[PDB]
Write a protein that binds this ligand. Structure first.
Ligand code: CDL
Ligand code: CDL
Ligand code: CDL
Ligand code: CDL
Ligand code: CDL
Ligand code: CDL
Lengths: 173, 50, 175, 37, 329, 49, 209, 41, 186, 98, 54
């Protein structure tokens, strides 16, 4: 009943739950939506709580995008928030969460946030420098300049010879 | 119904923007009659059969 | 989201991300650097200055201490104008010092310039003015997640400190 | 008009290619903690 | 036998047709005699052995003394169009790289950089084969109509006809160049690119570089005739076309200018750095030498003599080395 | 029968409740190994065929 | 140098820091989404004709008899969805006057540019959430359509439909802005001056110049 | 798509006109050859 | 012309490397102090005085009127009549290209890189000529590393300037997977 | 012969590639290590290990230390899981390490 | 052999590497080591070929 699979990061789940519960309590003061009840609220459905999440979904998404700051994303905060808002609204426009639990909505939003962060990081660790690719190494090697022959460039009478001048023009161009 | 509502909303927005005062019902009801008749006859046939 | 579908979703997402950023798996390292790097540097120690000079050789300095006294909006606008251009030398990186001094200025600059690419703080025990001057800005950058802290020991190894700072700033760069 | 082929770069790449599998060969042929007496 | 072999049989048949002599197999498929000697297997094999050179000669004669066939011309130039279609795109990118943005997109200003720029989009419509169908259409156009209207003609007449047809079909060349140099998928197709060009600039925008394309085409036709004849002056003509190559480079740059795909305009293209005029000259010469157009309809008398002499020399092999010289035959 | 050991209990099929499987931070990452393995495996398969 | 100039212009456009372009200053730059509809219409017509020909002849297979209706239905649904998505008024550009109290806009409707002027900033309002759209059934001249809409809505002649059910194909790629009396779609992927944009959307009037 | 339609129509017209000219020339040549063949026969 | 001394009345912070604009101004004043002749300005006791403002030190340039994604407009210059001049100039350029190459090769023979000097000592710090300004020079390896970094930036600018909001396919994939999971939950 | 040759080849290629580590990530409490390794077809395969079990063991033969890949700055480090009797191979290059 | 040697010498001289064979400068005309290496690479193999054939 419990596998050896890494669970999605829960760092922002408390913040998402707090923001959503605050916004929903602004409309349903008696709903009893509190952060301390997340462990028990996630097991109930919106119908049981008498809350129509469909109407407030867009406002919840906007508030979450404007409030939550993710430091794990590779994009600056403004771009990250705008991209998160667009992605979340597009994904949730076709999803009806009314008949499912609050935990499903919270986990879906957290998964979207984590996937956006991973895509921003290019599905690679942000704290690992990594190794350059073959193309990067080749481009750096090609961009590296050519030193040439310093002996021919050295100021000497012998270097004024026609043969030496030809060699310098051929090898130090 | 959702498609019809969206088409009506878009037509109203466009007519207000352009000062036309007439809704494009030809576009709002693109295939409403056909879809409704097909669904109704299918449902009636299924009810008669089963 | 689901254990059974996690692998398939990851594979499909990796395949699709190439459409947005072609050859991302081959140019991931280079992409770590932004197009127009904007850095805000906190720290006024001698070792901090040496590290800044070593790390930002190809960047342009922006002394924000000269803007003290003017209102936050004007200061932010001037900083944005300074750091939203590329010189003939093709140096697109700018690092600011002694600015912002408060959360209002920090937020104004971020809104004008779409955010600062990096906020590098060098905690040097031999420094006692940075915390007194720009604590609010440091707190704002910590909140926004653009803050990178690199503690420096004055009696440390300069080369190792420079290498660590370069790696940390490269990792912390944001688009 | 950036320059293209360079024999020195080619030789360096060949050396890197030939030296790449040395670590793997060493790891494969090295001893381990086990002593199957 | 009912679900795999029926679908797999055509593949094996195509493989065998490619890897076996179709004429020899057809000859062997008929067994017996009707009243004439020479239908046995031994006699058929002896005939089929020389039938290769006989059919080569007959095909060459058809391409010269009969109206040209588009299928035959495409078969002759299959490699230049089928497998190495992207070579044209990479050559165009190299030629126009002087005023392109490729050097800022993980590419170098060299043939390797052009190849990498072309291949970064894959092999398909956005990659190596981007514009392959346009290249095929252009080949089926002026280069083929010119053969039709100038079969068995001199160098001057061939050049004039080719110039006329290239002028007639030039806009396709400009569209193909723009598609080749479109590395960000700005244009969704040939029609989209042409529509954008016409909407932004006038119809004359499609005829940029025509007068520098025509002269290079004349030089290329001269070199093709020289190499077909096989005279020693083929190297001099190769040098001449190498010298005229900057005309082709300027044509490509003019076509690629005046658009978001390029950093320069028509006026600035003319005053471009002179050190990059011969961009991709050696790659272009190598590609042309390896896959020169096999237009047998334009082969002169000397070229036909060379081909027939080679065929006869190959045909002479069918004599017994140790045949006895007898007083009475 | 073989699982029903006389003196010692066999390990539970599920992980201990103490363990938490929440992801932390990445220590090591060499993604190009996947590409190298795919290349080598495909090459050996093609050669063997 | 040419690339440096182009990059500087791109950075300025992305940051939305354009100067005053004469009488008005551009503070928004957005683009609409285009979807394929002619290929789907052609595919649906081909599927219908093929089904009719198969029924007339009688030489078809069960496999194709199953597949062709499915392909035709999918093509028809995709065509309807793409038509609805394309015919969505999407705000393309917005300019503010020098006085800061008037705004002009240009919107795209299925690739057609429509220009609206004399829009006081006090009337602008960005819908953070899903608003409500009012539909008047009395306007409809089709009895069957009116009856169907009334039955589905379960309301009076004037029916209010929440925008949550409509955002799937109405504003799935943007927010909803109120340009006075009309409503437009503001895409998320756009270049705009955020400082002025937020104030005008909230309705506050910026200072002159 | 007015510009695209005009461009496509112009291309079709040019190709069709070239085809008409080629077919007219071929028809003249074939008629002359057929008359010569009939006379010879 | 290597050693020169500049003095700023507190308007330039020397604790950090000088800005590109500041170095450009210094070069533009040295190219006058050299060519126009010298009143013995630039020594420690007789330095060059400068009062640099924030705009001068920071602002890059002006005339940002380039129109992105634009096509040159024809049919107004009478291309039919003007193409002759362009063709003639192209022919002249093609004819002269071998001659220009030969002349440049001869110039290389008669010229050497060491002939020109590009090193200047300012405030006891060595600088090397850079495009239109100066660049601090400390070590050959450091200079080569700086050149490599500049080349890398120029090369990967376009790749790094990718579209953040082009996430249609990713959003579609996420939506499909979450809708399947929602069906499972229902 | 064909079936078993193909099976043996694929299985032994997978076994050879199993030792190498593609990715390693600690848990939130740093109590477990999730390791992504190579699959038979070159994809990612997940496994879990315990940091306490993980250990770097010296070679059984004491004269073979000089022959270890770890002698090279860009060699390989062989980390042994003492519980699962498995080996984890990591590149010594700092580019691959957090 | 001459072509390969000339190509290698040219590439290594472009990269700044010159084999330490022959004097750096000539005793009489002061010809450069690269030029004399080219001359030797061109001449010596021809003489060796002639001697071997003879
Ligand atoms: C004897 C008589 C001869 C007579 C003729 C002589 C002619 C001489 C001509 C002059 C030659 C001068 C020498 C230098 C030339 C260099 C090339 C050059 O000039 O080009 C410039 C340019 C230089 O490159 P660069 O990036 O600018 O700079 C290079 C770096 O500086 C370099 O730095 P780097 O770090 O990049 O180094 C690259 C490379 C440097 O190395 C080399 O490149 C040297 C290679 C030497 C050997 C080459 C042999 C093959 C050569 C080709 C053969 C065919 C020729 C046909 C010719 C025409 C015939 C009609 O480094 C390596 O060595 C890499 C390691 C791997 C090497 C190869 C390993 C082989 C292993 C073999 C054994 C395998 C295991 C077997 C056992 C197990 C069981 C099987 O090169 C190119 O751009 C080349 C482009 C070639 C394009 C070819 C056409 C492609 C078409 C693609 C079509 C795709 C279609 C897809 C369809 C899909 C449908 C689904
Ligand atoms: C070390 C070695 C092992 C040691 C231990 C061994 C222990 C004993 C194992 C005994 C296994 C059964 C042996 C049966 C021998 C053949 C009997 C026979 O005459 O039946 C054919 C017989 C054809 O006779 P026919 O109608 O006179 O046609 C004459 C034609 O010349 C020919 O017909 P056609 O030309 O019209 O059609 C050509 C071709 C058309 O070919 C195709 O359909 C294309 C390819 C289809 C997919 C192939 C997948 C291959 C990948 C691995 C699959 C693993 C097993 C999957 C099992 C799925 C079902 C649970 O059709 C076939 O030949 C049959 C299709 C292939 C079916 C193979 C997959 C199903 C196996 C079912 C039995 C095993 C149950 C599960 C065992 C545990 C598995 C973990 O089939 C029919 O009754 C009509 C077709 C529909 C029913 C097929 C029934 C199964 C046929 C099995 C074929 C032989 C392979 C069996 C083993 C597969 C791997 C485990
Ligand atoms: C093989 C067996 C059969 C052999 C037959 C014999 C061979 C010759 C047959 C020739 C006849 C074929 C039948 C007729 C074809 C007709 C095509 C046609 O009309 O298309 C038009 C064409 C289509 O429009 P478009 O699609 O928008 O543009 C093309 C795209 O750019 C797309 O171009 P792309 O180059 O980017 O394409 C990349 C390529 C990427 O893929 C590849 O290239 C892969 C290559 C792999 C290697 C090759 C291996 C060997 C072949 C294997 C084949 C396997 C089967 C393939 C089956 C494909 C599906 C059928 O494929 C694609 O991605 C294509 C995009 C798909 C949509 C469009 C094409 C649909 C498919 C048609 C295929 C037909 C092929 C037939 C011949 C066989 C070709 C092989 O448009 C134009 O050409 C417009 C030109 C406009 C020029 C500017 C005009 C300006 C105004 C002019 C004013 C004039 C008056 C001025 C007066 C001045 C004062 C006097
Ligand atoms: C087998 C190995 C190779 C395999 C290749 C792959 C093949 C695969 C199958 C086919 C498909 C692929 C097709 C090719 C793809 C590209 C390959 C590639 O990478 O190559 C490019 C690659 C260079 O590309 P890159 O690295 O990008 O270029 C670097 C720069 O970007 C510069 O590039 P750029 O484009 O900017 O050019 C500017 C130009 C700038 O320079 C100029 O334009 C100088 C202008 C000076 C003007 C002076 C004027 C003075 C006044 C006038 C005096 C004369 C006229 C007087 C008249 C008076 C009376 C009227 O630069 C040059 O001139 C130098 C360019 C490179 C020269 C390469 C020479 C190769 C020689 C090979 C050995 C010797 C021949 C052996 C033959 C026998 C073999 C058995 O070429 C090579 O390195 C070698 C490639 C292979 C060579 C094949 C041999 C030549 C065949 C054709 C010509 C035959 C001789 C004809 C004359 C003699 C007859 C007796
Ligand atoms: C990939 C192939 C999978 C085959 C599965 C086979 C299962 C064997 C079970 C073994 C246990 C014993 C069963 C009883 C004995 C079976 C004997 C036997 O093998 O007879 C087969 C029977 C023998 O044919 P035949 O006697 O030679 O008559 C020749 C006539 O031309 C035939 O023309 P006809 O008009 O007389 O056709 C009669 C038709 C009448 O049908 C019936 O047999 C009764 C009705 C069954 C319901 C489905 C009818 C087919 C409608 C289209 C598929 C709908 C999706 C659901 C399919 C569920 C599985 C059938 O029978 C069929 O052909 C039924 C199968 C056709 C399937 C075609 C689509 C392939 C993919 C299917 C799976 C897709 C994923 C499903 C996931 C789960 C969804 C819940 O039919 C076949 O040959 C079936 C295999 C055909 C393979 C080649 C297809 C054409 C080339 C590929 C086209 C790919 C693109 C287009 C399709 C894309 C996907 C939609
Ligand atoms: C059959 C003819 C075949 C000809 C083949 C082509 C190559 C050879 C001829 C080439 C000629 C044109 C070359 C281009 C010229 C460009 C302009 C220029 O600046 O010159 C480039 C350059 C000189 O320019 P540089 O910048 O002044 O460089 C000076 C460096 O010291 C030079 O340093 P290095 O880097 O060159 O190295 C020194 C040099 C080695 O040079 C030595 O110092 C070695 C001396 C060995 C002496 C052995 C005992 C001789 C006993 C008396 C023999 C009497 C004649 C017997 C004849 C028998 C029948 C054939 O080379 C080597 O050590 C490496 C190669 C290994 C030795 C292989 C030598 C084979 C020579 C085959 C041709 C011999 C022709 C003899 C003609 C008659 C002479 C009377 O010329 C050469 O590199 C070619 C040198 C040819 C040999 C010179 C021998 C001088 C000592 C003669 C002693 C006996 C007579 C004394 C008379 C005293 C007054 C009464």
């Amino acid at each position: 009943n419990r596998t050896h699979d890494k669970v999605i990061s829960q760092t922002y789940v408390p913040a998402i739950a707090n923001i959503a519960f605050t916004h929903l309590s602004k409309k349903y003061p008696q709903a009893g939506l509190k952060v301390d009840q997340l462990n028990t609220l996630k097991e109930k459905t919106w119908n049981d709580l008498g809350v129509n999440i469909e109407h407030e979904k867009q406002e919840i998404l906007v508030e979450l995008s404007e409030q939550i700051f993710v430091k794990e994303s590779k994009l600056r905060w403004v771009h990250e928030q705008r991209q998160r808002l667009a992605h979340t609204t597009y994904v949730f426009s076709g999803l009806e969460f009314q008949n499912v639990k609050v935990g499903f909505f919270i986990d879906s939003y957290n998964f979207l946030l984590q996937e956006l962060a991973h895509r921003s990081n290019l599905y690679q660790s942000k704290d690992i420098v990594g190794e350059k690719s073959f193309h990067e190494k080749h481009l750096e090697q090609q961009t590296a300049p050519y030193s040439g022959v310093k002996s021919l460039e050295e100021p000497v009478s012998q270097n004024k010879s026609f043969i030496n001048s030809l060699m310098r023009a051929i090898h130090n161009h | 119904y959702n498609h019809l509502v969206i088409k009506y909303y878009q037509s109203f927005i466009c007519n207000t923007l352009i000062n036309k005062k007439k809704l494009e019902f030809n576009y709002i009801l693109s295939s409403f009659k056909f879809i409704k008749e097909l669904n109704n006859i299918i449902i009636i046939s299924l009810n008669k059969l089963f | 989201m689901n254990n059974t579908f996690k692998f398939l979703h990851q594979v499909i997402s990796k395949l699709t991300l190439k459409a947005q950023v072609p050859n991302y798996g081959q140019y991931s390292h280079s992409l770590k650097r932004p197009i127009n790097p904007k850095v805000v540097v906190f720290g006024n120690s001698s070792r901090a200055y040496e590290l800044i000079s070593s790390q930002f050789r190809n960047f342009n300095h922006v002394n924000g201490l000269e803007l003290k006294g003017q209102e936050d909006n004007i200061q932010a606008n001037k900083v944005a104008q300074s750091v939203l251009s590329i010189n003939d030398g093709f140096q697109d990186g700018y690092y600011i010092t002694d600015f912002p001094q408060n959360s209002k200025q920090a937020e104004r600059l971020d809104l004008i310039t779409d955010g600062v690419n990096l906020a590098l703080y060098i905690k040097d025990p031999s420094d006692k003015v940075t915390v007194t001057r720009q604590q609010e800005a440091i707190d704002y950058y910590r909140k926004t997640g653009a803050l990178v802290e690199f503690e420096v020991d004055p009696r440390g190894d300069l080369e190792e400190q420079v290498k660590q700072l370069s790696n940390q700033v490269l990792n912390g760069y944001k688009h | 008009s950036s320059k293209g082929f360079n024999l020195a770069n080619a030789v360096n790449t060949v050396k890197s290619t030939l030296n790449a599998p040395i670590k793997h060969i060493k790891r494969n042929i090295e001893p381990t903690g086990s002593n199957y007496s | 036998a009912n679900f795999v072999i029926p679908y797999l049989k055509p593949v094996a048949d195509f493989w065998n047709s490619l890897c076996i002599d179709q004429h020899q197999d057809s000859l062997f498929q008929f067994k017996g005699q009707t009243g004439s000697l020479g239908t046995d297997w031994t006699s058929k094999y002896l005939r089929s052995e020389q039938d290769v050179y006989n059919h080569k000669y007959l095909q060459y004669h058809k391409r010269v003394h009969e109206a040209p066939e588009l299928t035959d011309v495409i078969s002759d130039n299959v490699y230049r169009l089928t497998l190495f279609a992207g070579v044209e795109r990479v050559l165009s990118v190299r030629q126009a790289q002087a005023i392109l943005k490729t050097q800022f997109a993980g590419a170098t200003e060299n043939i390797s950089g052009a190849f990498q720029t072309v291949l970064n989009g894959g092999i398909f419509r956005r990659g190596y084969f981007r514009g392959a169908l346009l290249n095929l259409l252009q080949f089926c156009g002026a280069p083929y109509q010119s053969l039709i209207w100038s079969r068995n003609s001199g160098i001057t007449n061939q050049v004039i006809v080719s110039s006329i047809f290239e002028a007639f079909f030039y806009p396709l060349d400009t569209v193909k160049t723009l598609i080749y140099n479109d590395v960000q998928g700005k244009y969704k197709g040939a029609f989209h690119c042409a529509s954008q060009v016409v909407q932004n600039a006038g119809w004359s925008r499609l005829y940029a570089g025509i007068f520098q394309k025509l002269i290079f085409n004349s030089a290329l036709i001269f070199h093709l005739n020289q190499v077909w004849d096989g005279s020693s002056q083929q190297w001099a003509s190769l040098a001449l076309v190498a010298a005229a190559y900057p005309l082709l480079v300027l044509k490509t740059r003019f076509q690629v200018a005046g658009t978001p795909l390029a950093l320069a305009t028509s006026n600035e293209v003319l005053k471009v750095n002179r050190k990059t005029l011969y961009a991709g000259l050696v790659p272009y010469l190598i590609f042309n030498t390896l896959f020169a157009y096999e237009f047998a309809a334009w082969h002169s008398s000397t070229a036909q003599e060379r081909v027939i002499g080679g065929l006869q020399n190959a045909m002479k092999q069918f004599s017994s080395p140790a045949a006895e010289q007898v007083w009475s035959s | 029968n073989y699982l029903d050991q006389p003196f010692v209990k066999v390990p539970n099929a599920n992980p201990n409740a103490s363990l938490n499987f929440e992801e932390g931070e990445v220590l090591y990452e060499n993604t190009r190994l996947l590409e190298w393995a795919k290349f080598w495996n495909y090459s050996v398969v093609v050669g063997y065929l | 140098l040419a690339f440096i100039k182009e990059a500087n212009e791109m950075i300025q456009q992305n940051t939305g820091n354009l100067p005053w372009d004469g009488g008005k200053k551009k503070i928004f730059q957005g683009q609409a989404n285009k979807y394929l509809e002619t290929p789907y219409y052609l595919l649906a017509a081909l599927s219908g004709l093929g089904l009719l020909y198969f029924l007339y002849s009688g030489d078809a297979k069960y496999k194709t008899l199953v597949l062709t209706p499915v392909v035709g239905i999918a093509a028809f649904v995709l065509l309807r969805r793409n038509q609805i998505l394309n015919r969505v008024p999407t705000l393309t550009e917005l300019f503010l006057h020098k006085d800061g109290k008037f705004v002009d806009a240009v919107v795209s409707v299925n690739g057609q540019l429509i220009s609206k002027n004399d829009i006081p900033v006090s009337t602008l309002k960005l819908y953070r959430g899903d608003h409500t759209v009012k539909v008047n059934l009395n306007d409809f001249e089709d009895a069957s359509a009116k009856k169907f809409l009334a039955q589905q809505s379960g309301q009076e002649g004037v029916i209010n439909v929440h925008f949550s059910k409509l955002r799937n194909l109405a504003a799935r790629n943007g927010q909803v802005l109120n340009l006075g009396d009309t409503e437009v779609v503001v895409p998320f992927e756009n270049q705009a001056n955020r400082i002025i944009l937020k104030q005008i959307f909230k309705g506050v009037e910026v200072l002159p110049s | 798509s007015n510009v695209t339609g005009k461009v496509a129509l112009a291309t079709l017209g040019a190709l069709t006109g070239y085809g008409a000219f080629y077919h007219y020339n071929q028809y003249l040549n074939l008629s002359a050859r057929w008359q010569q063949i009939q006379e010879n026969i | 012309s290597r050693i020169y001394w500049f003095d700023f009345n507190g308007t330039v912070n020397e604790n950090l490397p000088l800005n590109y604009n500041v170095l450009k101004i210094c070069r533009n004043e040295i190219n006058k102090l050299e060519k126009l002749n010298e009143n013995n300005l630039g020594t420690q006791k007789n330095p060059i005085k400068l009062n640099l403002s924030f705009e001068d030190k920071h602002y890059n340039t002006n005339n940002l009127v380039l129109d992105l994604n634009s096509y040159e407009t024809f049919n107004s210059k009478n291309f039919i009549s003007s193409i002759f001049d362009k063709t003639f100039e192209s022919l002249n350029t093609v004819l002269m290209a071998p001659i220009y190459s030969f002349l440049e090769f001869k110039l290389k023979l008669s010229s050497t890189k060491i002939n020109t000097n590009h090193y200047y000592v300012i405030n006891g710090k060595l600088y090397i000529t850079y495009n239109d300004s100066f660049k601090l020079f400390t070590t050959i390896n450091d200079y080569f590393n700086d050149l490599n970094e500049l080349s890398n930036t120029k090369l990967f600018f376009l790749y790094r300037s990718f579209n953040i909001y082009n996430i249609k396919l990713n959003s579609l994939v996420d939506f499909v997977f979450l809708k399947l999971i929602l069906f499972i939950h229902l | 012969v064909a079936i078993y040759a193909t099976y043996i080849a694929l299985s032994y290629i997978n076994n050879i590639w199993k030792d190498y580590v593609v990715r390693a990530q600690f848990s939130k409490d740093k109590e477990l290590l999730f390791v992504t390794r190579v699959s038979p077809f070159g994809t990612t395969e997940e496994e879990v290990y315990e940091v306490a079990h993980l250990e770097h063991l010296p070679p059984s033969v004491r004269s073979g230390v000089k022959d270890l890949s770890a002698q090279d700055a860009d060699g390989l480090v062989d980390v042994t899981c003492m519980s699962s009797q498995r080996s984890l191979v990591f590149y010594k290059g700092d580019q691959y390490w957090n | 052999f001459t072509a390969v040697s000339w190509f290698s010498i040219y590439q290594f001289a472009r990269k700044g590497a010159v084999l330490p064979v022959l004097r750096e400068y000539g005793r009489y005309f002061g010809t450069h080591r690269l030029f004399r290496q080219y001359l030797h690479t061109l001449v010596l193999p021809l003489l060796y070929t002639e001697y071997a054939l003879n």
